[model samples]
Every structure is written in structure tokens, then in C-alpha cells.
Target: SMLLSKINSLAHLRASQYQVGPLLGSGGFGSVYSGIRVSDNLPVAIKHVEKDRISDWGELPNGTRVPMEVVLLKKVSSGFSGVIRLLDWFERPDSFVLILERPEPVQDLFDFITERGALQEELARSFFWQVLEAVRHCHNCGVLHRDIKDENILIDLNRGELKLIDFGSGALLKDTVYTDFDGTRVYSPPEWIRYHRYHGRSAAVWSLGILLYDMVCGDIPFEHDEEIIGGQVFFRQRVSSECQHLIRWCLALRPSDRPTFEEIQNHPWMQDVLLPQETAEIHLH
Candidate 1:
């Protein structure tokens, strides 16, 4: 049972209404372009994908089917500072286009990290907690955001808030072992690499761990299969002991040894959570 958040309920359609601009980037199915929703000059992201090229599709509550990303994003709709909001979508004769909110004064975490190098532990904790809750929300909504990386996180420079983006590798949550993988290689769990299978929660925790390491260490702990299987992490920056401990727990060689989302949220390091306001709850509608 998914309930669209107040902001996530903005739905509309039309392919040629907006004036397309520069190329923000491209994906496996389509390219994303910066554009204005000419109606009111609202900034938006126009993503176009060939209808026949969509490899994954999911049915909506009303029984209409759409691309996997759109379906999963809708299931986990709304940003709690959680995900990039979906404004509208359109169907073309041979392709489909999705309109996404392109908020101002924002930059992806990858660019922010690349320019600032390793982020301060305090700052990283704030970002980490937001991501932790975001994943939890997706999980609760029966969605698995298989990929968690710096590039997929959007940072509001002015407020330092975070919003995750790109659910292209999303899948339905199942307690059973997943037989296939389709996420960032460096963030994959050891069991998946060694045994050719993985549990959803375990894999997600591993990637979240990778995200934390990237935020504080300025680099991922593993670049090769041996390194990932060996599961040894070294701290290059002056990160706190608690921070390193959490990362190691998450990057464990055994999937079952990793901490649960709740445990990770209450970790000593995250207790340093700056503002108590956003720490309220993950409103489950």
C-alpha cells in the first residue's frame, strides 16, 4: 500500500510542451536533458526512452503499466529529502518521456565530493542519515534501490540536504535470495560475488556502507574482486573511530554479519545527528 506524498502527487502529461535545453546526461534506456516546462518556465528534466527498449515494467495501483524506474520511484515517491520528485510523464508513438523536478541550487554528491575532497565526518553523518532513512522508506514501500552511489545523490548546497536519484536498478523486495545483480560493482556484497546470490537487505547495507566510505574516505574501499572479497578497509583521512567501525561492520565479508538499517541509524556516529527536527520519523502512509 503506497501513498503518494503531498509533493509527489503533481501529475501531468505531454511530450512536446517543454522547451528542451542542454544534456544533463544519458542512461541505459534514454538521455536526460535540462528543460523548462514552458507553461510557467519551471525547470524540469526531460528523459526520453524508446517504448520497445524498456526492459522492465511494473503495474501501477490503477493497473496502468510503466517503466520500472517510474513505477519504483512512484512507489517510494516523495522526497523526505528522500528521492527526486516526479512531476509528470508522457507517452510517445515510439518512445516515452519522464518529467522530473530539477531543483535549483543543487548539485549531485559526486561533483560536490570531487571538488571538496573528503567531507568532514559531521557533514558526512548528516548525509548518511538522510540516505539511510531514504533506503528504509524504499524498502518499506517494497522497492529495492539496488544502486546507492555518490552520483545518484543530489545535494542542496544552500541547506546541505540530500535527495537520492535514479532508480534504474530498482526491484521488488523479496526475502528470498536474489539470483541476479544489477548495481554498482564496488558496492556489491561479498556473498553475491562469492556465492552468486544475495539477500536484498544485505546487499543494500553493503552499498550504503560503500556510500559512507566514499563520503568520508574520498574513495571506495574496493576496486577489485579480491579487495572486495578480502573486505579490508583503510582510513586515509582523519575520520573518527566510530565512523570507521560502522563502515567495517557494514562491509563485513558475511552478509548476515552486517547491521540492520535500524541498528545503523542508531549507531554512535549518527547520534551526532545535528538537528533533531528531521530525526522525527519515517512517516509510513
Candidate 2:
């Protein structure tokens, strides 16, 4: 030690410890607020989830049952920077506060797309590649990110980096069909709407397709039930044939017809994207 220690004194109270900041976002489940990890002055996001709004619970490897959001964040100890890291969490009397690591100077991909009509093929590919990596890492950890959309994705405008932010709708991966769906409706697959059942991976793929379409086309392909069930997507902006082909393939009406993660990685459009960069090891401080 230098001389005497000058450090954070713990009151051991979760809410009182951190300096909770401004409101960052709001959704059906909860609201996200900007915050500061007072101990380290690190930027963090605080999500308040009402007890009644929880969609799923997950069991830790040790058999401790916790909220799905907490368990999956614990499981995905991935070093990749594309996915946001959970720093700590607390169970309050009527709600839960999830303290998540926040990227500095970030903007929503939703607004990113809206400001410009569409992203070029190359730029779209770069963001898409990072997104796929984020999902792949989650899947490898047996986590299913049930919700994936532009609004949930944050981009570091300066670094041109993308990080997936929300996991309120995540769950443990299972081979069995999932009947309960909780993600954005427009991003959902036709099979989910039609059969009311879907495989976890298949549904994730469908959302990925929707994301890609929104990035390149600058408009959501389906707005109503009939549009989704009809399985039709028209590009408002002309896009590369390779990208178009991949999007349609992922958006296929039949879950079985959708390509696996590996297959999608090998597709022509994805092939041109840069490989994942070397990421530093991530740890909870």
C-alpha cells in the first residue's frame, strides 16, 4: 500500500452504494438508467425490473435459482466485448436492480438506422458480424437471447463497435420447442406467430434476419400478422444480392429451412466481414 488506503467504505447497501444517474431507456419489463459505480467511478447501467414482470427464472450450475437475466449473465463469462457484462445485481423488496457494465459514448442502432436511410453493405456487414459473435458466445454458454433488435443494440460511434445491451428476455437454451415468446413482435418469425411454437435457435436466427434487413433496407419487413404469416420481405433500398439472399434464408417460414450459425457464418455476405478481433479477458471487479 502507498501509505494508508483511500478507498470506498462499504455500507453493504446496494442501492445506497452506487450513484444512480439519468434514465436511459424504458420498456415493458423495466427501465434502464445511467449510473456510476462509485467505488471505481466506472460507467454502468442500472435496470429496474419489477418482481411481477419477470418472464423466466434460471437455475445456476450449483442449483441456486435466480432470475434468468442474472443466471445467463453469470454463465456467459465470455471475454468478447460485443456483449455487455453484468457487474452486480440486487433483489429489492418489490423489484430487482441489475448493474451492468456500460460502454462509453454509445448510441442506439435504432436511431443510427433512422438518421440515415440505410447502411452500406460493408458497414452493415461489420455490425452484423459483431452481433452474430455476441449471440454465438451466448449460445456456446447455453444461453438464448430471446430478444435481439436494433434498439437493444448499442454502438460506440467513435470505435465503430457494437455491443448487445439487454437480456430481459433471455433463457437457458433447450432442444425442445418453446411455446412462450417474449421478444418484439416484428422481429419474431412466421412460425412463432403461426404455430405458436419455435426452436430457440430458429427464433434467434429470424430476429437476426430482421436486424440485417432493418440495417440495409432501413424499414421493418413485416408490420402486421398477415405480413409475417405471408412470409414476404421487400427491400426499400437496393441491397447486395448476397445480403438479400442471406436475409431471406434466415427469414424462411419453416424453422427447419433456416440456416445454422455455422452455415450463416460461411455465407457469401458474412464471408467478407472481418474476423473477430482479439478481446481482453473480462472479469467482475
Candidate 3:
């Protein structure tokens, strides 16, 4: 109640550039609302984060700290594609408001899968390839999304476009190992469950495998940590052998055995969707 009161009190402090709308959803961090830019009435998503929930911040000279999520979002917007764009941010006494680009008629991949009962392989290929490209872009920029799941992916069903969202769980890539994990528990990789530590890229690949399975089979492959650690994967629905192989390749129990994004891009199944060889070479930069 106190938080809601604070949110409302600061509502009047909102910048005139955008008008707030109904609540889109709420989570541990704070609430997200649908909003619209006043200039062109462009739709946007505004995220409100209470100060207390932030555990990290980027230090500025004069000793002020800014939320790491805000810092990371700013960096990501500059170089990434297939990601939600951050338009603006404002700081209030109790919270920080983030203005994000919102695509209308967008549905989450999870709900889409539920409604469609699993997508055709061709469709999954198109979508998953875009996701991989996004992941590649993030990694190349030294960003680790830390969370990759159907819920974090938004689909424009009408336009066949996908945008990755939610950078609250993201982090900059550092040489120091990460012991704590954030993201969906079900999508965790085997090494993370066993060792409580894993490289970001390996974890990303593992989640991508889970996502691929979910898209084609309409469900996750593992139900429990034991299944994940033991590599007990069962395919209830049949998919192409190549696709199955790719999933297995990504889901290897050992992090060292997982495929890199370059390998993923070159896999025979993905070659059909990949850019021209010359263009692909440019992305390596």
C-alpha cells in the first residue's frame, strides 16, 4: 500500500512527453504500465522500479550511483538489434521510470505457443534465428542477458517479428565468475544446477535449446533438476533429425561441450536462414 501510494504521488511528476496508461504487469522489482508518447501518440511501455529493490548501481563521479539496469539498457540500445528500445528514463523520489518502445499487437511467445499448440518447424526456424542473432549482438557488445525464455520474448504475430525484452536480469560480461543465477529456474542449464556457476554463453545456449524444444513440442523437455543434471531429455513430439541434433548439441551436460554462436549459425539447419557468406563475415566484426 505504501509503495502504491508513493507511485501515485509521483504520478503527477511524470514528464509531459508521455501519458501513463493501465498497468501491464507487476513483479518483484515494480510495475510496468502501458503508455503513449504525447508527441506522436506512439505506444510505449513504462517500467517503474522502486529504489529499495536495486542491489547494484553504476557509480558516477561525485559519488552518485545509477541503477545497473539503466546503465546496461543504455549500452544495449546503441548496438543491439531485435531488442526492445529504451526511449527515456526519469528518476523520482521513490522510483525510476523507464520509457520503452512498445510494439502493438505483440504477444509473448509462451502464450502464443499455448494458443497455437506448437509452431511449424519453418516458423520456429525464422523466429529462433532472429533470437540467435539478438543473442549474438548482445554477446558481441559484451552484454549478458542472463535470462532467456519465452516470456522475455515478444512476438508480433501479424508481422512475424520478435523482440527480446527485460534487461533487469542482464549484466555486463566480466572475467569474474558469476555464482548467483537469475532467470527462469526451469530453463537453467545442467552445469548451473550442478555447480551453481556457469559461463553466460553456455547458459544462453542451454536456454535457447529449451526454447527451441518449447516452440516445436509445446513444452519444456525437463521437469526437475535431476532431469536436467542427468541429461534425461525425451521428445514426445517428433521434429526433424537436424533440429533434434541441434537441440542436443546445445543441451550438452558439460558447458565445455556446448556449441558457440558461430557454430550455431553454421549448422546445416540454420544455413538456409543465415545471411550470405560475405555478409555473415561482417557480423564477426
Candidate 4:
């Protein structure tokens, strides 16, 4: 339960030019509401953090600046089509609020499975390739999205786009150069789980591989009977020959053995089997 002392009225914070509306989401953190900018009548998602849990200056000790979600959101927002945009943010002694481009409720991939037996291949490709592009952008920025799972990737109901969300501080390694792995342990890469070290892009690639397999196969590739998930998927489970080989390449036990994102992009699976084109063009930018 949230403490009563932590709540603060935000009505005064809104611009006279904007109007805050009913709550859109509520959780342990706080609540998110839809707001309308009076000037343009555009909708925005306003996220307010719990005041008691935050520092007096509204900053984390490590200078996290704002919530992990905001940090990741800011970092991923640039030049990425499939990420939520940060419109504005504010800092108060007791709490803070982030204004964002509002999207529809998150369309969980798992939920889609229960609703529809399996996702179509073309649908999978469309979402997968876009996520790959966003992930590649993160790699280029030297940041790793430690969490890669179905629910975190939200769908834009209005535009039918895939947008990644929810950066629970667990997304970043506790120590920038240390050995503590966070995120849903089920989808965690073997390198961090086994070696207790963060491998950045390589580890991210591993989770993406597993997620892709899960989406396409309707089951996780490994440890399918963990009981913890109550019939949940596992990364070390057995799979069909063709997909098993591909997944194995992604989940290689050794960090050095795992293929890079560049390798996956150029793999025959993507070229010959998936996306077939007559010409290979390379342009110097």
C-alpha cells in the first residue's frame, strides 16, 4: 500500500494552458493520467512518481537524474520510430512528473497468443525488424536495454506501431562495470546468469533471440518446465532442428561464442530465408 504522506496534489503544477484528465494508469509507483494541452488539444501521458520513495532533491544518489524509465525513454527517443517521446519533465523537492506522448494500453505479446493462436510471420517480421533497429540504435549509444520481453514492448493502437516501454531501473546494471544482473530472470541471458557480468549488446541480443523464438514458435526454446512460471517458457529447452540451431547460436554458453548483432543481420536466415532481395547495396554515409 502507498503511504498517504507520499501523495501530493499536482493540480497547481499544470500549465493554465493545459488540462489534466482522469487517471489512465495506477501502480506502486504512482499514477499516469491523460492530459490535454489547451493550445493544440493534444493528448499526453503524465507520470508522477512516489514522493516518499524519492530523495529530497528528487534525484537518486547515483545521479540517475530521474526514474530509470525516463532515462531509457530519453535515450531511446532519438531517431527511433518505435519509442515513446518525452515531451517534458519537472523536479520538485518531494516528487517529480514526466510528460510523454500518450499511446494506447500496452498490447502484451503473451496476451495476443491467448487471444489468437499464433502471430503471423509477416506481423512478426514487421515488429521484430523495427525492434532490431531500435536495439541497434541503443548499441550505438553504448546503452543496453537489459529488459527485453513481451509486455515491455507496447503497441500504438492509433498508429499500429511497436513501442518499447517500462525501464524499471533494473534495465541498467547496478554498477556500470560490475557483476549484478537484473531484469526478469527467466529471460536473462546465460552470460549474466552464469558469469555474473554484463556483456551489453551481446546479452541484449541473446534475450531478443529468445523473445523472437517465443513469438514465432508459440513456446520458449529452453527450460519449458520450470514450474516457477507455471507452464512458462525457458531458454534451455529443446526445440525443432532448424529453429533450435538458430536459437543455439544466440544462446551460446560463452559470451565470446555468441554472434554479434551484425552477424545476425547478415545471417542467411534473414537474407535467404526471411528477406530476399536481388541486390546488396552498401553506401558510404
Once fitted onto the true fold, the runs of candidate 2 whose alpha carbons sit more than 4 angstroms away are 1-16, 25-30, 274-285
The candidate maximizing TM-score is 3
Candidate 1: global Cα-lDDT? 0.78
lDDT of 2 by residue, 8-114 (tens): 32434842357876687544344787888766778888777777877688776779756888888887855656788888776666677788877776778898787
Q: Go through the candidates in order and give each one's C-alpha lDDT.
A: 0.78, 0.78, 0.78, 0.58
Show pairs that collide, candidate 1: 79-82
TM-score for candidate 4, residues paired by index? 0.71
lDDT of 3 by residue, 50-126 (tens): 88988767743335567878777776787437888888887888778888888776778888787778777767787
Look at candidate 2 and tell me the lDDT of residue 107.
74
| Model 4 per-residue lDDT tens digits across residues 1-285 | 111222464336652255677786543344777787667877777777766764222233347667655666666667646666777766667666777777554445566655554455445555566677767766554446677777667655444466665554435332244465556666766655555675576677777777777766665566522432232334343344544455567666666777777777665445432321111111000
lDDT at 120, model 2: 74
Instruction: Name the lDDT of candidate 3.
Output: 0.78
lDDT of model 2, residue 274: 45
Lowest lDDT 10-mer window, candidate 4?
276-285
Q: Which portions of model 1 show Cα errors greater than 4 Å?
A: 1-16, 25-30, 78-80, 276-285
Across 182-216, the per-residue lDDT of candidate 1 in tens digits comes to 76566668887788898899889999889899999
Pairs that collide, model 3: none
Write down the TM-score of every candidate. 0.86, 0.86, 0.86, 0.71
